[PDB]
Amino acid sequence: ALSDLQVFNDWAYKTMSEVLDQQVELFNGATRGAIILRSAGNTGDLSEAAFWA
């Protein structure tokens, strides 16, 4: 009978991690330019540039 055999349950490490919930692919062209993602560095905590009123 099947009880006499030694049943082995198959397993696998598909290592298939979750990423996130909401979609964040809306930058630059994706937002026609509404939201802009650059890669610029800056000093301090403030980066201010004056202009004429």
């Binding site: 290592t15 991690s17 979750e18 990423v19 996130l20 909401q22 964040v24 809306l26 930058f27 939201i35 993602l37």
Partner: protein
């Protein structure tokens, strides 16, 4: 190595997530500060409609 890889990809997702979230929150707060606020719940039932866009 694989723990580092998993952390890397999840971090790649979550960095964009919180960067955008903070950007949207800052935009909403700044627009509230600037007076460019229009609420539609005070005008009848509050639900999105083309008239609200206009």
């Amino acid at each position: 190595q694989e723990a580092g890889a998993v952390i890397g990809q999840q971090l790649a997702g979550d960095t964009m997530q919180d960067m955008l979230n903070n950007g949207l929150a800052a935009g909403k707060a700044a627009f509230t500060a600037g007076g460019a606020v229009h609420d539609i719940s005070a005008a009848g039932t509050g639900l999105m409609t083309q008239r609200a866009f206009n």
